[PDB]
């Protein structure tokens, strides 16, 4: 409700006047940190290659995880099948050689 030290708590953006802490809309937008912002940031939406590991809350943005057979901040890449000479694919890392 009330802006502590000019700032609103996580999951809130301060009102236009400066007196109120409006809450972020769950599913729509979020804020992660103590802030005096005019809006909450909109949730990330998942691309094709991806699934929604954690849905977007008010304190947390959405985690999209690359699907089975790929990895990642712009598009999911196909994993390197083999290693180069003289040298496991996850949803966030290539193969390590």
């Amino acid at each position, epitope marked *: 409700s009330s802006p502590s030290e000019g700032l609103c708590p996580p999951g809130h953006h301060i009102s236009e006047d400066g007196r109120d802490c409006i809450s972020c809309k769950y*599913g*729509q937008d979020y804020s992660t940190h103590w802030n005096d912002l005019l809006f909450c940031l909109r*949730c990330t*939406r*998942c*691309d*094709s*290659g*991806e*699934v*929604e590991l954690s*849905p*977007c809350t008010t304190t947390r943005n*959405t985690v999209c995880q*690359c*699907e*089975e*057979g*790929t990895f990642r901040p712009e*598009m*999911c*890449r*196909k994993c390197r099948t083999g290693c180069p000479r003289g040298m496991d694919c996850t949803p966030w890392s290539d193969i390590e050689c």
Partner: antibody
Framework: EVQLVQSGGGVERPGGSLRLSCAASGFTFDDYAMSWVRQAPGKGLEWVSGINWQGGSTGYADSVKGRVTISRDNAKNSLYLQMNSLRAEDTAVYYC??????????????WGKGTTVTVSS | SELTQDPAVSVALGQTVRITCSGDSLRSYYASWYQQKPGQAPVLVIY???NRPSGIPDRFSGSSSGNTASLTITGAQAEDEADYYCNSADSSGNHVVFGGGTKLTVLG
């Protein structure tokens, strides 16, 4: 540029079997995910099944789950959909479609000419 | 599951039209649009964010607020009287889902 040849416009009695085959040329095939997506006479598109670049991920629409099966032979740049125990509601045109990424997905950047399948009692 | 788009809309040649596609999973999965001229293979128009494959006109534009995606044609020409569908993943992430399609007529 990409090319996709479907084939085998089949007339089949209910409870019968088909094997839709799609071949693809003009792009690396094993780099990309695939999917079948259909459409009955003048009545909206409907996603059938999806496959991963490698062949691991395989997705099937409730309306077909267990009845059809999906598989690719990256050695022959081919992608199949075996059908088993057809339904009169499986009367559709079937488009094999290239999904844009390597992972199983919903952005079909290319669409074959599509094979017609008719199921009548 | 099921994202519902109006079955029929219209535009006067040279005007703008927005075809909206609505479904409680478009809150957490980017949209994607196709075009289907009577008896052609659907042709991908706008995949997610707002990026368009090489070869489709500038005129076209995808957008998203809340649980609605919206395809937008500016200055709709004669060669746009076609069916436009939308799709995302379902509520979970495993299935795909298509909009009931919109018959966009261009007013001749």
């Amino acid at each position: 540029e990409v090319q996709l040849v479907q084939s085998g416009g089949g007339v089949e009695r209910p409870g019968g079997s088909l094997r839709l085959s799609c071949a693809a040329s003009g792009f690396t095939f094993d780099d990309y995910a695939m999917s079948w997506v259909r459409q009955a006479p003048g009545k909206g598109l409907e996603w059938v099944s999806g496959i991963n670049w490698q062949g691991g991920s395989t997705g099937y629409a409730d309306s077909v789950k267990g009845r059809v099966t999906i598989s690719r032979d990256n050695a022959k740049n081919s992608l199949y959909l075996q059908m088993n125990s057809l339904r009169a509601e499986d009367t559709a045109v079937y488009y094999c479609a290239k999904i844009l990424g390597a992972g199983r997905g919903w952005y079909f950047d290319y669409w074959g000419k599509g094979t017609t399948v008719t199921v009548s009692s | 599951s099921e994202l519902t788009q109006d079955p029929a809309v219209s535009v006067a040649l040279g005007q703008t039209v927005r075809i909206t596609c609505s479904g409680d999973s478009l809150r957490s999965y980017y949209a994607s649009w196709y075009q289907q001229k009577p008896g052609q293979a659907p042709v991908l128009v706008i995949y997610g964010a707002n990026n368009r494959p090489s070869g489709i006109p500038d005129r076209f534009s995808g957008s998203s607020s809340g649980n609605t995606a919206s395809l937008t044609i500016t200055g709709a020409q004669a060669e746009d009287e076609a069916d436009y569908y939308c799709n995302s993943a379902d509520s979970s992430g495993n299935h795909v889902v298509f909009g009931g399609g919109t018959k966009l007529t261009v007013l001749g």
